[PDB]
Amino acid sequence: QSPWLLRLELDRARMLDKQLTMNQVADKISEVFSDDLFVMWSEDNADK
Amino acid sequence: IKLYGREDKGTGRTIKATLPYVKQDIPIVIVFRALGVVPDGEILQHICYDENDWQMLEMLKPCIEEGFVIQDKEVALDFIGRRGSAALGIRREKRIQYAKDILQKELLPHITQEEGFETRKTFFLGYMVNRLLLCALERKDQDDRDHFGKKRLDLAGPLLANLFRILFRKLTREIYRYMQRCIETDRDFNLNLAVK
Amino acid sequence: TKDDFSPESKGFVENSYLRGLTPQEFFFHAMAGREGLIDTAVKTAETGYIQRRLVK
Amino acid sequence: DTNPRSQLHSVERTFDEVIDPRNKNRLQSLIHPRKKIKAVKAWHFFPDTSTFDQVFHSLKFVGSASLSKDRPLNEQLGQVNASILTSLFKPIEINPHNKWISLYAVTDKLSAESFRKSFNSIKDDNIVNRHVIYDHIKDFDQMFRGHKKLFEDFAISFDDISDRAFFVPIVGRLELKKKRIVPGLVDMVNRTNYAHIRMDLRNPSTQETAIRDSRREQYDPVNYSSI
Amino acid sequence: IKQKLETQFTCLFCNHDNSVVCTLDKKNSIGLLECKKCNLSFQAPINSLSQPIDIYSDWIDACE
Amino acid sequence: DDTITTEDCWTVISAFFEEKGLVSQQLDSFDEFMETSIQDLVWEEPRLILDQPAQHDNINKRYEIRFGKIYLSRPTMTEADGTTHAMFPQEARLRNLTYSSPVYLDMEKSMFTSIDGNKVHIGKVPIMLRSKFCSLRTLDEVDLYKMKECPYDMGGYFVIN
Amino acid sequence: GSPSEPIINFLEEWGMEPLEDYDPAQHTKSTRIFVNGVWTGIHRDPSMLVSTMRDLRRSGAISPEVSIIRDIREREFKIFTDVGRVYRPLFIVEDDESKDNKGELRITKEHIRKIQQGYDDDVYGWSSLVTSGVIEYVDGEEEETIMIAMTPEDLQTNDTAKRIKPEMSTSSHHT
Amino acid sequence: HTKSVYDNGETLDISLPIHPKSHIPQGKQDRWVVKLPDFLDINAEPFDPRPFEMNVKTHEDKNQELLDKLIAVNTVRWRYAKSETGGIFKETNSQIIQWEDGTYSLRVGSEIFDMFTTNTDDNYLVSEHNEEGILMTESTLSKSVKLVPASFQSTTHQKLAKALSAKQKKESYARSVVTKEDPEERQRRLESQENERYRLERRRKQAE
Amino acid sequence: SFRFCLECNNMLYPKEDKENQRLLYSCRNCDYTELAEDPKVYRHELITNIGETAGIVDDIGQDPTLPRSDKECPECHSRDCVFFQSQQRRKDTNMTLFYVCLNCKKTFRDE
Ligand SMILES: [Zn+2]
Ligand SMILES: [Zn+2]
Ligand SMILES: [Zn+2]
């Protein structure tokens, strides 16, 4: 693995409006990139 | 001064300037170094006026990355001269002199024409790039083409001046040709016959 | 004044033709009439071309 | 008032209406035409006699060549520093196309301070042989712009004890920019400048002093004319 | 990817014109000028913005 | 003071039209062109230079001619017989002439040699009516009738053929 | 069309400093100055400069057709002496706060009677009005930065036939 | 670590002649560079009333004469003043006035010109030694000072405004002239003569 | 805001030391290298708000074409104020007003 961290902040308001789940986004990224990227996602109760 | 690269397309958003009597577009960093400002910090000082404006800085990053290959004044002048649409096979020294001619003159002629007076041209290039980026960042509306304060009206004066300039240049060329033809006889031409 | 969105500041002619138009309303109404004239004089050629193509 | 007599009379009237700096009452009488504010202090405006023979140039650093911007250079030369106030410049030109300026300074603070004190206290005819060694620091590219008129620019120096202000002419302006030496020319570069320069302080020769006095005779002939 | 282009430059050994072909390889950052008649080969380094005029000028400078 | 009414605004507008007129821009532009623009157009390229290194004894001869002042005249008519006389716009209109005036240029010729010219006529410029170089700028009101010119005519146009 | 050399001389005389004495980091608040489209210098107190230039133009020292524009939003101060700019005359309202005549037309009945007579009381025509500072010309670009009243009745704060004037209640006060 | 390029150690034993200074700055080697306006001039020469009166020039051009008068009356000058005790003293017509706000003003006679100061860094004054080809520093130019007229009502400003306003009023380059004959007569007569000598030359060449 | 080389003036690019596992900024035309203080190498904002209130000048109160209101200043509590809408002019820009007093020039809203 590489030390280079790539993170991005999702707008909570529009994420809720689109009725999406953080797990769903992570699953989509994993499916499109297989196991080439290790992905962690914050819980829905996080501030951001 | 064209800004290449669409929104999320064309990789970097490079900026290529178009100069008179030059066949191909040239990146802005190269022309800046050609005018005689080689360090990147000085170029950024010339272009921007607020270091906190990270958006214009990240817009400028691809231009610096592209122009990093050239790192000296003389090599930049040679690159400008190579595409200067002049005769093919011109030597490097003559290429540099041709670039200096095409850079001092014919490049923003309304600013100045004399030697050692190119700092103002660099500052005006900075102003133009600043305006281009400022409109690209949607911070300002694009200049209105129909704004009547940006129009001019040509009355009898300017129109007659243009026509008379053309006709007088034609008369001067005719006098020149007649002089060349008549010197062969080595005669004291009246100069009242050369004119038509 | 700058940033004025009132009805009279963006082309609402409050008066009638009998009552008469103020200079600002006069200019705005002239702008609208010019647009009408231009639209007619431009669409006529496009319509003529369309009808010729249809007939052919 | 185009009459030459009128112009001369205006000249003597202007000469006569000079306010005495010691006169506090007359100084307070003067009021700014627009600010309507009283005057506090005054200084006579005089030219400088001992410095007209020399040639003065305004030297400036352009862009990144700023000494304040160059943090390691400022740290080495001291964070007003006497080393800057005693620096030497050596213009060397290999050819018309290639030109640069060489900068030298005194790294030691004690030597620079002693040299500055000796230089600024030259009012007698005894100068100690201060063999001060100057070390090269940096080189810059140079451009020069000349003044068409003699006194286009003038620098003003003050003297509170005498209530005067001495001004000196400025001949031209010299601009310096940071120059990156081409790796292919360092061989000739090492043969151009020097690592050290030694300055020896000696009293000026009689002939050179007479030449300088003859040059100054244009300005002040009462105290310097040859007999 | 090597790129082969026909150029209208003049060979300085054979003096035949329109017999110069420029071969530049961006992968290895090299550019080759070959005379279709003289069979002479000129090699020079190239950059990302290099063009056949650049290699031609380099050849001219090398020749003199 | 006292308030300003609409009638005072119309007094000011009357003053404006009394000074300027309705075609003042045409006449002003033409006067500017004739007074200064022609001379500057000539001086834009003030030198024609020919040189010759004669070896036929190296004698480098430079032949250079310079353009000097511009001399203008009132419009004039030159008949076929040869006589020339002042021309007025009515005669030009009736006879299908052109209301134009000659332009004279001073040319100075120099013969530079190192071993190592008067008012020439260059053309005729048409004259805008009622401008500074028109014959009707003077003549007052009475003489304008004798020349068969309408006093209500405002000028601002040329007469070509 | 007018020569721009007097404008440059006045600007240099009144404190404008040229470009070679300019550093973007230092003068982070100075105002640029354009003359006929070329950037000629910078200034740090544009208000007094524009006031001086406008007063000079009104006094006749500068040609009345010279366009003087100040763009406060963009920190620019443009000047035009170009040929071919369409202008038109306007009355001048005394807008100096320090003046007792604030918010009133400069032209008075004395000027009207002088115009009617045709001479001053120790030829008085339109040009005299323009050079006496009561009327000035503005072009399409200077109009962006001015506030015009439609009628002299607009300068101060139930019929079925007469027309209705704009209320203009968005602004508490007008200058 | 950018290693020092120069390590030869070669040293020059050059000794410079230095002259004593008539004055010495106290507390700070600071000087102010001041741009000279067109309406202000410096006359370093001592004032000589008789040559000045005998060398006053009168010109037809009113604008040039007024500008010369203004610059002459505003020129900074100095002269030797004989003291009442028999000594000689340097007397000047120019002074510097500092107001309560701290601003400085240059005064010549009754005229007052304000000073606008802008701080400048890395700007120094040097002394040129041409015979040795080296530059010796003198002091630091901390501030750049501009000279501005105090007010509109100042006589200098009014004279400048008058001169510049009437300077651009005079513009008439083309000079009128009266044509007495056909402007094309010279061309046709010279063409006739040229054709005549062409015929004569052709006959001579055929006979030669 | 990005830094530049202190002796070459060129732009310093981020770099990682394999043996030290530290972030460094290194010039490309010179061997100069300086330690990185912050880990935020790069940041891109999909939705941004800069340019909305940054368009402020000290002499905005000298514009005669700007409307004058009577909103109360939080700082000076003056009776005279000048207001304008957002300088940023994207197609989806809000119409909120920014009020500037003539003494303190503080920008605030009625929200
Ligand atoms: Zn060959
Ligand atoms: Zn570097
Ligand atoms: Zn307040």
Cβ distance H101 to D41 under 8 Å? no
The three-state secondary structure class of F16 is helix
Q: Note the ligand closest to the C-alpha atom of E36.
A: 1
Which residues of H fall within a CB distance of 8 Å from I31?
A: 1-2
Q: What is the DSSP string of I6-73?
A: TTT-SBPEEEEETTTTEEEEE-SSS--EEE---S------SS--TTSS----TTGGG-TTS-EE-PPP
Q: What is each CA distance from F52 to B133, B175, F56, F62, in whole angstroms?
A: 55, 17, 11, 6
Q: Specify burial of residue E55 (Cβ count, 10 A radius: 0-12, 13-18, 19+).
A: buried
**Beta partners for D106?**
none
Chains E and G touch (3+ CB pairs under 8 A): no
DSSP state of B186: T
Q: Which residues contact H2 (CB under 8 A, 6 or more apart)?
A: I7, I30, I31, I32
Name residue, tokens 């390889």.
E25
**Beta partners for G93?**
G105
Angstrom distance (rounded) from CA C3 to CA I99: 13
**Beta partners for H34?**
D154, H145
**Strand segments (E) across D62-180:** 88-92, 100-105, 132-146, 153-159, 164-170, 172-178
Q: Is H145–D156 a contact, with Cβ atoms under 8 angstroms apart?
A: yes
Contacts of the segment F76-84: beta carbons below 8 A, 24+ positions apart: F76/F101, F76/F102, F76/H179, F78/H182, F78/H183, F78/H184, F82/H182, F84/H179, F84/H180, F84/H181, F84/H182
Q: Please, which chains are in contact with D (at least 3 CB pairs closer than 8 A)?
A: B, H, I
Angstrom distance (rounded) from CA D126 to CA D123: 9
Angstrom distance (rounded) from CA I89 to CA I95: 10
Angstrom distance (rounded) from CA D180 to CA D138: 10
CB atoms within 10 A of CB B5: 14
**Residue from the list G14, G15, G63 with its beta carbon closest to the beta carbon of H168:** G63
Give the chain D residue whose CA is nearest to the CA of I9: D64
Cβ distance B88 to E9 under 8 Å? yes
Cβ distance B75 to B31 under 8 Å? no
Angstrom distance (rounded) from CA I87 to CA I85: 6
Q: At what angle do helices G5-13 and H155-167 cross, to 10 degrees?
A: 170
CA of B82 to the centre of ligand 1 (A): 23
Q: Could you confirm whether domain E1-64 is CATH 3.90.226.10?
A: no
The three-state secondary structure class of F12 is helix
The three-state secondary structure class of F139 is coil
Query: Minimal CA–CA distance to D57: which of D175, D140, D168, D172?
Result: D172
Contacts of the segment F117-122: beta carbons below 8 A, 24+ positions apart: F117/B191, F117/F65, F119/F71, F119/H177, F120/B191, F120/B192, F120/B195, F121/B195, F121/H183, F121/H184, F121/H186, F121/H187, F122/B168, F122/B171, F122/B195
Domain ranges of chain E: 1-64
Angstrom distance (rounded) from CA E14 to CA E36: 10
What is the 3-class SS of D54-66, one letter each residue? Answer: CEEEEEEECHHHC
Cβ distance H95 to H105 under 8 Å? no
F34: closest CA of chain H, how far (Å)? 8
Angstrom distance (rounded) from CA D63 to CA D69: 9
Q: What are phi and psi of H173, to 5 degrees?
A: -95, -50
Write down how long chain H is: 208
Q: What is each CA distance from D68 to D62, D65, I32, in whole angstroms?
A: 12, 9, 18
CB atoms within 10 A of CB D115: 21
Asked, for residue B174, whether it belongs to a domain, the answer is no
Which segments of chain F does DSSP mark as H helices, in order? 6-19, 24-32, 38-43, 89-95, 142-146
Q: Is I7–H2 a contact, with Cβ atoms under 8 angstroms apart?
A: yes
CA of B38 to the centre of ligand 2 (A): 11
The three-state secondary structure class of D188 is helix
Strands I107-108 and I97-101: antiparallel
DSSP state of B25: -
Torsion sign (Cα): B89, B92, B93, B95:
positive
Angle C24-C29-C34 (CA atoms, 0-180°, nearest 5)? Answer: 130
Q: Hey, what CATH topology would domain I45-111 get?
A: N-terminal domain of TfIIb (2.20.25)
What residue type is F100 in one-letter code?
S
Helices (H) and strands (E) in chain E, counts: 1, 4
Q: Specify burial of residue D42 (Cβ count, 10 A radius: 0-12, 13-18, 19+).
A: buried
Please tell me if residue B139 touches chain I, with a CB cutoff of 8 Å: yes
The verdict on whether residue I81 carries a ligand-binding annotation is no
* Two tokens, residue B77: 């002048």
Q: What is each CA distance from B13 to B2, B4, B64, H22, in whole angstroms?
A: 10, 6, 11, 63
Name residue, tokens 């080969």.
E41
| Assigned CATH for I1-44 | 2.20.25.10
Q: Is I6–D180 a contact, with Cβ atoms under 8 angstroms apart?
A: no
Q: Is B172–F120 a contact, with Cβ atoms under 8 angstroms apart?
A: no
The three-state secondary structure class of F110 is strand
What is the distance between the terminal CA atoms of chain I, rounded to a whole angstrom?
A: 32
Q: What is each CA distance from H47 to D11, H76, H106, in whole angstroms?
A: 9, 10, 20
DSSP state of E10: B
**Strand segments (E) across chain H:** 13-17, 30-35, 42-46, 76-82, 88-92, 94-99, 104-108, 111-119, 123-129, 134-149, 175-176
**What is the CATH number for B48?**
3.90.1110.10
Q: What is each CA distance from H185 to B187, F78, F120, H179, H193, in whole angstroms?
A: 21, 11, 11, 12, 12
* Two tokens, residue G104: 């009133």
Q: Please, which chains are in contact with G (at least 3 CB pairs closer than 8 A)?
A: B, C, F, H, I
Cβ distance F69 to F40 under 8 Å? no
The range of the structural domain enclosing residue B144 comes to: 1-152
Angstrom distance (rounded) from CA E62 to CA E42: 9
DSSP state of G76: E
Asked, for residue B106, whether it belongs to a domain, the answer is yes
Give the helix, strand, coil percentages of chain B, each rounded to 5. 50, 5, 45
Quote the number of domains for chain B. 1
Cβ distance D173 to D58 under 8 Å? yes
Which residues of H fall within a CB distance of 8 Å from B190?
A: 190
Please tell me if residue D63 touches chain H, with a CB cutoff of 8 Å: no
E53: closest CA of chain B, how far (Å)? 7
Strands H42-46 and D153-159: unpaired
CA of I104 to the centre of ligand 3 (A): 5
* Two tokens, residue F27: 């006449």
Name residue, tokens 């070679």.
G20
Q: Specify burial of residue F47 (Cβ count, 10 A radius: 0-12, 13-18, 19+).
A: exposed
CA of B83 to the centre of ligand 1 (A): 24
Instruction: Bin B85: left if φ > 0, else alpha if -120 < ψ < 50, else beta.
Output: left
CA of G94 to the centre of ligand 3 (A): 25
Domain ranges of chain I: 1-44, 45-111
Which residues of D fall within a CB distance of 8 Å from I7?
A: 70, 72
Q: Is D63–B39 a contact, with Cβ atoms under 8 angstroms apart?
A: yes
Asked, for residue B175, whether it belongs to a domain, the answer is no
**Beta partners for G80?**
G67
Which segments of chain D does DSSP mark as H helices, in order? 4-16, 24-29, 71-77, 82-85, 109-120, 186-189, 206-216
* Two tokens, residue G18: 């040229």
What residue type is D159 in one-letter code?
D
Which residues of I fall within a CB distance of 8 Å from D178?
A: 9
Angstrom distance (rounded) from CA B50 to CA I50: 13
CB atoms within 10 A of CB D5: 10
Q: Please, which chains are in contact with I (at least 3 CB pairs closer than 8 A)?
A: A, B, C, D, G, H
Q: What is the resolution of this structure in A?
A: 3.4
Longest dimension (CA), chain F: 91
